[PDB]
């Protein structure tokens, strides 16, 4: 995997 | 009688053939002379057919030569490949690290650009938290640079984009230090947010290059925080464009009174290098409609800028995009006819509920925006290869054009050792570059530059700077001038030569035949 | 009587001079008029001599202009400066580290290229163990790239050279993703083992550059093992050539249907940089034998490829090398006449006993091979400066040629910080570059790329990539067209003008003198 | 009577008009024919006015074509951007570290350049110890490179500048190793202290590039000591010039028998890179005074060098500087008329007391020198834009000129891994580069290079080397030739055509009117 | 800071 | 040193 801001 | 006037015409004629035919006393002689006259006339007609075919083809004549007449120094437009300021980028990264929800960060900063940015990102975050695995490509495109430039007021972006005071460390032109406030002019570009055009100012601080223009630019991004994990920062990366993530300076050399188009023209300079731009000026002069095609003004634009074919072609592309997809492409100039057309990346119709729930309506609106972008991109790629459409825009090369051929070379600017120490002292000891950001409104940037650009790590930190050296390599201008190859005077001379060679007639000899036919009409 | 016909001719003549001479009633008047006529005739003859000298020199007329007619997008040939695959190189290095005798390593690998390579190296190793100090230069030349390409089946080398799937990370053209299997065409070059030519495919994955061609290439060699000691690896280094050990991509921009000659044309791109190639297309049109020299086809080759002067010149050089040294140079195309000629670096005559003992016969054969290479090199250097030999090959420039002028610039592609993180995610997160080598036949490469291209060391590992940005800078084509300056029609016009000015004759006036001489012959 | 001779002239005239007028038997017919003749004459005069306007404008005719005639290989001038030798620089730095007073260090070294350097620096040190805060810019300018080159004997500087044996690691041309003593010629430049020009030597060591010139150069400065504090080293940094602190090689490609002007022409190559220079030769032929402006020789110089417009322009600039400021600029050639003019940076008038006290007289002399430098710089910047002054020097382009267009590209020369190991072995194992400095007079340099260029740190140390690859890209020469467009023969033909078309006269017809006016003068 | 030679 | 393969 989860790419987070 | 007919024979009387025939004999008269035969005796006072200046024509060379019919005197033989009229006074002929033998049938075979009459036949021979008539055949001679007819053959001469036919060959004369063939040669004149060739002559007139050459003339009405309106050929052009071109000469290439070097002339001492000097051209004005070209305008130089420099665009940092990093759109936003380093301090703003670090602030955004740290804010997202502390809290990854953009909605909660809207009121955490007093900077207007940050507030607008976080509002815009929050209008997409819930979708980005649910649909990465299913539509990774869509979110990459939506979070590109052009989306923010098309939806945020440019006067708000200008407060966070690269500033002139923090971009141009030093400048020199014609042996004098440049005035940064009077010589540089800021312009907005949708991809390179802030760009600056240098306009030459001749001498009325006597230092620097005498035969050209030189400047030191801060272009690297080594002072940005190095995250331990991959994190998305919207507005930074133009997904899969040809200039998607490059580092350095984009430099465009163009005539002084023209608008630069950085994404399709110019040169690149990497940080840590010194670039030499040897300009060889050229001038082209062209002929008008009958012999060629040239124009003095842009059909789509006003008269405040000098004409270049690129402007006309780009405006034609924008015109064809607007008619097809119903929206204007942000990567092309907005036609000065109507400015009610919305950018294809406009998204102000997104509801506020998309900040809170990942509803299917928000996803459908995202898909609609993606489809609009795809329409614009598809029209961009094909319209230039369609000759029928392009010819309808009447884009013709300028009648009087100045062009520049540039020799491009690279050096490693900050030399290792003592000369690099001298360069560092020049930048930070004499010019006092850090002291320009010790002002209240930029206190955070001051600490970052003081820590980064310290004496201990000068060999690595100075690699973020770049130098441009723009100079005129040849004083003489290579002039290409068009002219009409076959003037009416030359046509008259050729017609006279052909007429004299084959039949011997003159135009006052035609007055003799006019007199003869007057006499015949009177006698009849 | 003669006077009767003379008086008649004088009264019905259209010639301007001899009427005065014939009817002259004074001797001094006759002398004056005869002198006038003779002087006019002599000056007329001189002027016609000048006219005919101008005409039979067959001068050419050239015009340079910009036209809107578009040229097709050029073919792009990319050649990795590293010939072999990284995994194969590491395998060879580790095999030699474990055991430095190539003979014992022949059966240690199932890869066909490795077996052939070790056999070829073993046919030289005993000499290399005994004669480094005495002939260091010879062994450097023998172990060059061209020796292996001239002695190993190219279909065997292709299994170990750089593969397309492991070379082109991504591609984009005309706003669409490229199809790597349909658009790229592999070709073999003796120095750059595997090369790929991109052929444009217009749109019928809407992403990427709209006005050109862009691609990301893996070109660095940072993943190779770093030996603690200097070790010789044959087949890697072309000893003391101008491109002996460079790192990057060789890029050749050429007309779409032509064969690229990478070693004498193209441009270089270093790893870790983004290169912009601004193409300014040009077109040249030339005139045939009487006014110039041009050809539509290659005298030495077939008709399957478009004609370029470089192909003819290289084939002429190969022809002269074959006749002199008795062998073909591997660095030049093989003439399509006879293919029974062996390469000058052919060494299949080496006995198997050279694998076991450093006999003087093996050394003599090595010296013979070195002398053959020296012969080829000597003929290469001098033949181009010998105008007599070069002119005999009848290599003339093409009658209709398309050329490209390229603006070259460099950026630092993977930017430090967040944009570099975005680029890394694009390469490895979305495209999943490593997953293309997780296949069985490439399991070893997978582990190497997984360890090398990890998130922690992305700033250093991504420097092995390079990006090319090829686009057309100017839509208008600069056309140079030759034409005949002095046509036969212009010659006729000039002759008529001269004839009218000096003597006043017309061609039917010559019929009058023909009648006069007929009358004289009848009277005589 | 008048009517008798008029009737005679009317009956034996070859003019077409006045026979009608003279024999006219009606007043209206006489009026009509006279009007016809007058109108024909007037139109003829207008057309001849146009013809003569075209002729006496002396137009030029230009043709652009490719020819197989080969040009000689260009001379290559290479100038290391670091002026002094690395060992000398380290010695100076360590001497200043041990004792920062240059006066006490005058007798500490037997090297002549060091003694002269320390004397010159001591003549300024007391001022530099007192006036940094008040005039930082002045001391930066005084301690520049050009001050030392203008005040120290060039034969003394040559002992400490970059030596050929320590600069060119290897060279190859036309498939043969270059002879460094016979092919390279040393020349002195005020900024780049030592420069070397390569002059081609065709083959009568068969190795290297066959179609061009290649060399490996030591250009980096990574072996210099890394000071913990910023220290001033005079003679290293040219303050705020466009090439102030760059690292690499300056390369100038010019015709074989011409003097290179490195500061305004050439290309840059950074260390650690391999540069490819694809030359496209060109030839220009120009016409003399009546149709153009060209010269075969330099008005200001002797005849020992081939003429280039740059030499004339630079000598004109020097001439205008000498007349205005009373001194010659060291950055321009010294006119070969008078050599009694002192450089504007000459400072031999400084008293010896300035070594001991910072008196106001020494400060006034420093200000005078600064003002002289400012005068020279001011005249340099403005004189080129003053067309009146530049035109007075009669600098015209050469009548027969050879020019080169260069394709510029960069690779990373020492590849990471095995190929870099091969390159390192070639440089240090076979060529034995370090062994060239194991001589007594260079023992200190030997230890520095042995420590720096060791096997362990080869990946970083080899980045100080650079490679140049200069080759001819196209064998055919693009020839631009001027010629007269409108010859006197063409003028005669056009005049004849116009005369025949409008009035029908020939030049022997003018003999008839001359006879008529003779008869009238006799009768009167 | 005082810069020294 | 002796250079080995
Ligand atoms: C750089 O340019 C600015 C703007 O032209 C200069 O500021 C002006 O200076 C003049 C006289 O020097 C004043 O009369 C104006 O009122 C100033 N402000 C304007 C025109 O807005 C400035 O002096 C120049 N040089 C610097 C910055 O040192
Ligand atoms: C000047 O421009 C006109 C208009 O673009 C050209 O005429 C066109 O030529 C193309 C190609 O031959 C045709 O497809 C078009 O139909 C023509 N247009 C019209 C309205 O007939 C003309 O050839 C150009 N001439 C020059 C000298 O540049
Ligand atoms: C890329 O090109 C290949 C080769 O043309 C495509 O494979 C063909 O696809 C068509 C229909 O799309 C089939 O009818 C053929 O049988 C396929 N194989 C051939 C022609 O050898 C492929 O679809 C293209 N796109 C990719 C790889 O996604
Ligand atoms: C066209 O090619 C022919 C043949 O190469 C040229 O004639 C040669 O010219 C050279 C130089 O003047 C002579 O050395 C040769 O002897 C000539 N060949 C022959 C067979 O006579 C000719 O000059 C060329 N013409 C043009 C216009 O290109
Ligand atoms: C490189 O050039 C030098 C200078 O020309 C050569 O030295 C000369 O060699 C010739 C015969 O080879 C002798 O007759 C001269 O006396 C030598 N010295 C001169 C001309 O000053 C040298 O041999 C060449 N090759 C090298 C250095 O190996
Ligand atoms: C050749 O050079 C002469 C002298 O430089 C040129 O004549 C000058 O032209 C300029 C611009 O028209 C005038 O300002 C000067 O006054 C002229 N000089 C004189 C002495 O009259 C001439 O035009 C040049 N011609 C060509 C074909 O190059
Ligand atoms: C070219 O553009 C015109 C615009 O009116 C369009 O109608 C036409 O279909 C286009 N042609 C092609 C081949 O796309
Ligand atoms: C920054 O500005 C403050 C005043 O606002 C000043 O006291 C301080 O010395 C400045 N920073 C420097 C010169 O290090
Ligand atoms: C200088 O800055 C670097 C980071 O750029 C830092 O690691 C180093 O400790 C600093 N040196 C000093 C003396 O503060
Ligand atoms: C040029 O080539 C021809 C090939 O037949 C050869 O005979 C001649 O000797 C060569 N000339 C020179 C000067 O090498
Ligand atoms: C490599 O392929 C295997 C199947 O052969 C798969 O199980 C594995 O997950 C792949 N590697 C990855 C995705 O890390
Ligand atoms: C990443 O790879 C580098 C070598 O390229 C290695 O030194 C480092 O330990 C690796 N990091 C992790 C977390 O495995
Ligand atoms: C041009 O140079 C001349 C040299 O005599 C000088 O007299 C004149 O003032 C200059 N013109 C300008 C505008 O500087
Ligand atoms: C340097 O020269 C000396 C002789 O002066 C020699 O003994 C020594 O071996 C040389 N250095 C080497 C080869 O390491
Ligand atoms: C090689 O030289 C480097 C400095 O360039 C030094 O740090 C290193 O210790 C040296 N290695 C050996 C084995 O001496």
Author numbering:
A (entry chain D), E (entry chain E), F (entry chain F): 608 to 612
B (entry chain A), C (entry chain C), D (entry chain B): 2 to 205, 211 to 530
What does the study report here?
Here we dissected the structural basis for neuropeptide-gated activity of a neuropeptide-gated DEG/ENaC, FMRFamide-gated sodium channel 1 (FaNaC1) from the annelid worm Malacoceros fuliginosus, using cryo-electron microscopy. We solved high-resolution structures of FaNaC1 alone, with full agonist FMRFa, with partial agonist ASSFVRIa, and with both FMRFa and pore-blocker diminazene, identifying the ligand-binding site and elucidating the conformational changes induced by ligand binding. Each subunit comprises a minimal N terminus and a nonresolved 63-amino acid C terminus facing the intracellular side, two transmembrane segments (TM1 and TM2), and a large extracellular domain. The FaNaC1 structures presented here capture a ligand-free resting state, two ligand-bound desensitized states and a ligand-bound dilated channel state.
We examined the structural basis of this partial agonism by solving the cryo-EM structure of FaNaC1 in the presence of ASSFVRIa, a product of the FVRIamide precursor in several annelids that gates FaNaC1 with relatively low potency and efficacy. The FaNaC1/ASSFVRIa cryo-EM map was resolved to 2.4 Å resolution, with a discrete density in the same ligand-binding pocket as that described for FMRFa. This density was best fit by the C-terminal FVRIa segment of the peptide, and the N-terminal ASS segment was not resolved. Full agonist FMRFa and partial agonist ASSFVRIa induce highly similar FaNaC1 conformations. In addition to the high similarity between FaNaC1/FMRFa and FaNaC1/ASSFVRIa structures, neither preparation yielded additional distinct 3D classes or any indication of conformational heterogeneity in the image processing. Thus, the partial agonism of ASSFVRIa does not appear to derive from the induction of a different conformational state compared to FMRFa. In both ligand-bound structures, however, the channel pore appears closed, with radii of ~1 Å at the level of G503 and G506 in TM2a (G3′ and G6′ in a TM2 numbering scheme). Thus, FMRFa- and ASSFVRIa-bound channels have probably adopted a desensitized state in the prolonged presence of agonist, in accord with the large decrease in current amplitude that occurs within ~2 s of FMRFa application, especially at higher FMRFa concentrations (for example).
